[model samples]
Target: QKRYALFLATLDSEFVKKTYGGYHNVFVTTFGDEGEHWDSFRVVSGEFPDEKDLEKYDGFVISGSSHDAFENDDWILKLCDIVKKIDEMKKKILGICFGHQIIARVRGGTVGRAKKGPELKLGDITIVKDAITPGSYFGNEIPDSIAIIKCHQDEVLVLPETAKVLAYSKNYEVEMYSIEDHLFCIQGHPEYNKEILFEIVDRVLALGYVKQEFADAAKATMENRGADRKLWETICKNFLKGRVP
Candidate 1:
């Protein structure tokens, strides 16, 4: 069986633990298979595997964070360094949300606060024409567009020279991108469900990070919207499992 590790960048909120065990389990349940070995390191707390053990896993996943990807926080910097080493190894690495932007920044791309503000709800992302690689991770069954749960105020402003644009929407030009064949970026939360999003909205509101009106609008989308969960799962699984042609 394949072995993988999740570089969990944030601690699970109390709600997630009570509802879905933990973020690590959530990711494993979403993207892993039976008998496969999956491990997690809480990168936010300065926890990471020793560099010598890098090859023991098949792929690595960098999770989202409330911290800015551009910030020079110690753990963030360390994470970037680890990513660079992973790239040199040509090992597979999948990035989600903050993970996406950080990989972009480290790989000669640009990321900053979004001019359109936060995409704090489920939104549609359009796959650019001919962007999907032939016989790539998704094969020929990719969709023209997909809706996903988004909750971020930062965005990937530019892509690395080596990165290929995959899908995008009006608010962000680089919603999803890939670097060579080993690195992938996704700016939305495919692991999230309505309850998780609702809790996040409520928490952000209480923290005064978002206006009441914006929170209401975000919640409205949660009530009657569907995300392409299985499609994302397939894409992520293919990438991690080295099935990306």
Candidate 2:
């Protein structure tokens, strides 16, 4: 029987839980497990996979980190090496927001804040291209635009030539990309539900670091809750199969 191995880096396990929730919500609901499934998940920061242990997993999911992708920390360097190896093995990989940023950085791209404004919290974003499978995942049946939710301080300024464009957001055009057939990424947090989105914005606003303009933008998106839910489920649908069965 085929099994998929998932990796959860040092991010909030709540985010991890939501991801699994989405996997089941999409794939399991749509198509029952086609085969045996297992998740050899682990968190790596100061520690990581042993050579033998790393090779055993069929595919992995790298979660977004609090750490910036461009930082020169030892662990960041090591993570880059791990990404390179994962590429070499041609394993099915999924990179979340920061995970996506790291993948671009690891492969010679640059990441920095958006020039227009900080896309720091929930906002309605436009999909620049139907780079992914388009209308199939979302029951919309139309291939035009997707109401995307986003929250990020940094964006990928440069992408490796080898990477293929998947989807794009209004402010962050390179919001989604795939390095190879198996590797996938997205800038928005599909794992986050309405509750998590509210908490994240509230917490950040309470901290007082968020600018008034951006904070207001975040607040406005909350008012349009329907659009937010539609986007989250749509993106989640794309990754459901990696864990199905």
Candidate 3:
């Protein structure tokens, strides 16, 4: 069986625990296979796999966090160092939301608070042609554009020269990108569903992290649309399994 690790950069919220058992289960349910083993580390609390254990896993995933990716916090810096090592090892690593921004920063790109502020719901993303090789993983089945759940305040403003942008939308550029086919970064959360997103909006509102207008807009978008959940799951699964070339 192939082994994989999930670097959970944020602590689970009360709603997440009550709804999905935990955030770890959400990823497993979305990405795991019968022959694959998955493990979780609370990277937000400074837990991570040791260097000696790095090669034991086939791939790794970095989860979203409430903390700012551009900030030079101790744990974020440590995570950046770890990501650099992962790049050196050429191991497959999928980064989501804050994870995405951190990868861009680690690879000589730029990241900062979004000028337009947080993206708080499911929205559209357009895939760039010639960005991905044909017949590798997506085959011709995936659409040119797809909707994905977005809940972030930071965005990748620039990309490393070695990286290629795969998808983008009006609100954010570099929604999806790849580095040497080993590292994948996405600014949205594929693991999030409508219920999870709605709950999050309420939580962020209660915490005053987002204004009422933003929450209202997010809710408005949610009413008549949904994300391309199956396609994203397929892409992420193929990448982690080393099928994307």
Candidate 4:
């Protein structure tokens, strides 16, 4: 059976573990198959797969964080270390939000805060034709543009030298990108559902990152609209499992 691990960069809220059992479970259900093994390393709290044991995994994923990728936090630096090892080994990786930015920064890119404030709504992303070439991971069913949950303030301001952007939106330049065959990263939360969106909205609101009406407007974006979860599931799983379509 294949094995994968989540380098979780955020702590569990009550609702996260209570509703889905844990964020690991959330990822397990979102990207797992019947006979695969999945593990968690809470890198935000200084947990990570040891350098020598990194090859025990078939692939790895990094989670969104409450912390910024541009910061010089010790754990973040250590987390960057493992990611570099994995990259050198040419292992598959999936990065989301902070995960996306961190991988970007680690691989010789620039990241910065958004001048338009944090994006916290369902957002549309246009897939580039270059990403869906003859052997790309994206399948035949993906649309020209798909809606996914958006919830980050910092963004990838510059692409790493070896990377190619896969998707974009009107509000941001790098919605998705890839580095060789080892990494697939997305700016939106493909694993997030509406309730999770609300939880995050509430979190940023409580932290005063967003005003009430801004959150209200963000919440309204999801009343009937939904993320393209199934499509993202297919893409993410394909990347992790080394499937091409």
Instruction: Show how many residue pairs clash in every candidate, following the order shown.
Output: 0, 1, 0, 0
- TM-score for candidate 4, please give it: 0.96
| Candidate 4: tens digits of C-alpha lDDT, residues 1-245 | 67898999999878999999988888888898899888899999998877888888999989898899999999999988888889999988899999999889889999889755689998899988756765557876657898899989899988899889989988788999999988889999998899999988998899998899999999999999899898889889888898877
Question: How does candidate 1 fare on TM-score?
Answer: 0.96
Q: Weakest 10 consecutive residues, lDDT, candidate 3?
A: 133-142
Candidate 3 lDDT over residue span 98-209, tens digit each: 9998888999988888977778888989988777677665655557898899998889877789888889888777889898878988899999999999998988899998
What C-alpha lDDT do the candidate models reach, one value each? 0.89, 0.62, 0.88, 0.89
- What ranges in model 3 sit over 4 Å off? none
Q: List the residue pairs that clash in candidate 3.
A: none
Candidate 1, residues 140-160, lDDT tens digits: the string is 676789989998889987778
TM-score of each: 0.96, 0.75, 0.95, 0.96
Q: For candidate 2, give the lDDT of residue 110.
A: 91
Which candidate would rank higher by TM-score, 1 or 2?
Answer: 1
Candidate 2 has an lDDT of 0.62
How close to the true structure is residue 91 of candidate 4, measured as C-alpha lDDT?
Answer: 89
